[PDB]
Amino acid sequence: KTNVIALVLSVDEELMGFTSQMVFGITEVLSTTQYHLVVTPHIHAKDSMVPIRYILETGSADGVIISKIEPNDPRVRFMTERNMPFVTHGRSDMGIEHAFHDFDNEAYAYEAVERLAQCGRKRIAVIVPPSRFSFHDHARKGFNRGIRDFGLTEFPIDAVTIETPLEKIRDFGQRLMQSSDRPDGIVSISGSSTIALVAGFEAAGVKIGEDVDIVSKQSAEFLNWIKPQIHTVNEDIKLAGRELAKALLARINGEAAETLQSISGPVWS
């Protein structure tokens, strides 16, 4: 009716062009269509319902893409109640079937511990999203299973997440390698975070690949350039964009959500 697709994604400090690749992928799918893409950002987490209210009260879009999905997500419920077609980048757990595309963060976290185990590492720390997101739980599940399956121990970290400012993450990283009790392995769920942490580690005297190994996700090729000694897994965010756009269009045409669900796995560099 309006020919607008809305993308609502929170603005994070991010160093790999997530937004660009996501937008690129969406527009690939929309390019042969009459649809315009509009992005509606919010800066704070607490403000995550704000773009949804505007879109729905004004109904200026025909469909909505959202991300950073909680297990009990009020936006999923909100748009489900008002019959606004949507697709999620991520998953919920609330008894509502919807279209989605997600990355397998459980498999990633699990394979990350495995790699670190093959590297001879014994005490693994993990850097995760805030606990309120579904992908935190996926990652924490894969991580738990890896620690156990490979008989290692977790070096615990409650001071940072992947949404902590990169400079504070740099501080923490350095602060962390300057104790006697420190991890010899890191699993990170964010390349942007990894970069900052790697900096702190070095400003603390740590060689990477020798004194500590690190597995990280990456959405862009830029890590293997910076430090090729980091073990990397690729998340395809352009592919996420395309899939989300495909699924949202099909939903707008009334197709069943249950047929519009997909999951992409880790691809080692």
Angle at 15 between CA 13 and CA 20, to 5 degrees: 95
Q: Hey, how many other C-beta atoms are within 10 angstroms of the C-beta on 231?
A: 22
Query: What CATH architecture is 1-104+235-266?
Result: 3-Layer(aba) Sandwich (3.40)
Quick one: three-class SS letters along the chain? Answer: CCCEEEEECECCCCCCCHHHHHHHHHHHHHCCCCCEEEECCECCHHHCCHHHHHHHHHCCCCEEEEECCCCCCHHHHHHHHCCCCEEEECCCCCCCCCEEEEECHHHHHHHHHHHHHHCCCCEEEEECCCCCCHHHHHHHHHHHHHHHHCCCEECCCCCCCCCCCHHHHHHHHHHHHCCCCCCCEEEECCHHHHHHHHHHHHCCCCCCCCCCEEEEEECCCCHHHHCCCCEEEECCHHHHHHHHHHHHHHHHCCCCHHHCEEEECCEEC
- Report which of 220, 236, 242 is spatially closest to residue 25, judged by C-alpha positions: 242
Cβ-proximal residues to 102 (8 Å cutoff; 6+ apart), any chain: 88, 89, 90, 91, 135, 262, 263, 264
The domain segmentation of the chain, as residue ranges, is 1-104+235-266, 105-234+267-269
Report the C-alpha gap between 49 and 57 in whole angstroms.
12
Third-level CATH fold of 105-234+267-269? Rossmann fold (3.40.50)
Beta bridge partners of 187: 126, 215
CATH topology match: 1-104+235-266 vs 105-234+267-269: yes
Q: How far is CA 126 from CA 36, 69, 228, 241, in A?
A: 39, 20, 20, 27
Please say whether the beta carbons of 234 and 103 come within 8 A.
Answer: no
- What was the structure determination method? X-ray
Q: Are 239 and 264 in contact (CB under 8 A)?
A: yes
- For the chain, how long is the longest CA-to-CA vector? 63
